[model samples]
Target: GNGRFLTLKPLPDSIIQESLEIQQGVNPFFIGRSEDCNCKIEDNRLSRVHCFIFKKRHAVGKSMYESPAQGLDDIWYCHTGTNVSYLNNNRMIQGTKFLLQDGDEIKIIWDKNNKFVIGFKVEINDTTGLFNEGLGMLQEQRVVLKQTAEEKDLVKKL
Candidate 1:
């Protein structure tokens, strides 16, 4: 085993209980309700393409396109959809690429009463400690979709 992996484990209380292990090189791991998604939740509250994750390396720009010079500097990032999503109970901005942490939780919907609220729990195994000191490092990167905004509108008034 490479000992480098990111697993999105579905909480027992969540409707979708299957765990999804994200692999490297497969950029943009899709997690959504659409049939085309890799980890489909199939819930009305979620958008067709809810959210996704991807791996990023430590580098500067066109100047420092060499290498890490140290070791594996790969980090995973999370990007949410338009409707509503959360990372560790914190609201995820529409176009922000959030840095994922171990033991973090991704909520499909903010409403607690919503049956499909807390969907997946992030299980990041960083035994290599590549993210330890790098935690203080801050970086921003450029990170789409459409769907019904409200589930309540499914059954419109006559």
Candidate 2:
């Protein structure tokens, strides 16, 4: 089963509803959105916010603040598997906390009247050293290639 994925049998609506009722309203940071509570009759990925929350307890990475003086807040997301990128001009404010629980309703808001992009903050574990290693290796390779090319040009000049 390492490479093979197994699909579980779907649970009935009654079971799912009961689970939600029990799990809902538990998180302190829960932000309930009416649009997110509707039932879907068709299979779709749109009209849904894909959110991933990281709690302080389980978080392993370093916490980075967007601004130290003004305490600005910003949202960040992972790119290229592990690279974390943040939105420009937005900073992670002081009041925002990462402690979360199940059933935490995340209210995603649009910026600049752009409905396609929604913003949220996540607690991430930074493994910057690993990424830095790759960068250093690439830089070294580029330097060597450049030196070899220069030597070839010198020979042509001769």
Candidate 3:
């Protein structure tokens, strides 16, 4: 039950950063420069747990987003408290969540020289969403793996 990941391509000629993957579960995947963080930014900026993407439920038709200023549905939340980030040239307020549509661009800055713009790419087969499908798949896989070792466990008990 490995969760999905987003591959953000750098926008314009901004600097590129790297981040690592955290534990994959029902929780949202994170992005930051630190290795402990879910999605590393390669010497990125903002907070180590910079932000995360939450899954949204479709309304059987088309999905609509909430107000950009007041924040909206499950999309992303900036972890940097009181620190604002850039999304499509709009300032994402601190401690508030925002919506990120496909093809949205974000500019994250650790500082002046260490900053980059990443364009969000959504691909179901790729990394369209960062939310968990459910919390049932992981445990099931573990049990299956443990049973696989049964062939080596019994050593002629008699």
What digit string (tens of lDDT, one per residue) describes model 3 on residues 1-158?
26444434444444553323323232355555554444555533456555544333322333476422222122343333234556655555434345444444555543555344443332222332333321211232211111112211211110
Off by over 4 Å in 1: 2-4, 59-71, 125-158
Candidate 1: tens digits of C-alpha lDDT, residues 1-158: 25336667877757767787655434456666774555557667666556666555544444355543244444444444566676654556444455565665677665556644546876665433343322324462212212233211211210
What clash count does candidate 2 reach?
Answer: 8
- Model 2 spans > 4 angstroms off: 1-52, 58-96, 117-158
lDDT of 3: 0.39
How displaced is residue 79 in candidate 1, in Å? 3.0
Question: Which digits, one per residue and each the tens of the lDDT, describe model 2 over residues 1-158?
Answer: 22111111112321121111111111111121222422111112222212211111121244475422122221111111011112223222212222221112222322344332332322212221122211122223211101134222322222
**How many clashing pairs per prediction, in order?**
0, 8, 10
In candidate 3, stretches whose alpha carbon ends up further than 4 angstroms from where it belongs are 1-5, 17-26, 58-74, 77-83, 110-158
State which candidate has the highest lDDT: 1
Candidate with best TM-score: 1
